């Protein structure tokens, strides 16, 4: 028995943008649609609206936001 198609989506253009826990080729089922847009420098409040069909209460998703600075200190 394989894991379900739980996925990591990564917006970064350098990597495979959708990956499943199963190792199923879910990124091939995107028809060449790509995530294209980054969160710009110094972006404050943002509202993200998702939609889901086929889910049950108690399942969670997550949003994950890196922190990469040009310098060891400053730049806030």
């Amino acid at each position: 028995t394989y894991p379900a198609e739980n996925v990591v989506v990564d917006s970064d253009p350098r990597e495979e943008q959708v990956s499943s826990e199963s190792g199923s080729p879910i990124w091939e089922r995107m028809n060449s649609v790509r995530f294209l847009h980054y969160i710009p420098p110094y972006t404050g409040e943002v509202t993200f609206k998702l939609s889901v069909s086929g889910a049950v209460p108690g399942q969670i998703a997550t949003l994950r936001l890196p922190r990469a600075w040009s310098r060891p200190w400053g730049l806030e």
């Binding site: 995107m30 028809n31 060449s32 649609v33 790509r34 294209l36």
Partner: protein, 55 residues
Amino acid sequence: IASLIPLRHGCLVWDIVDNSGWGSETAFGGSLLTGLVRAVMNIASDGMTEGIDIY
């Protein structure tokens, strides 16, 4: 099958594969916004013009 059709080590097995799909369903282009456009080609009755039908 390996007992019925024995093949020696290093036997070169020729095949022909359709990695185009022009005459049934494929894509010739698209957009990163909305995806690839699915299409078919058919040769019209003169043998020289190909129609393209979009799915």
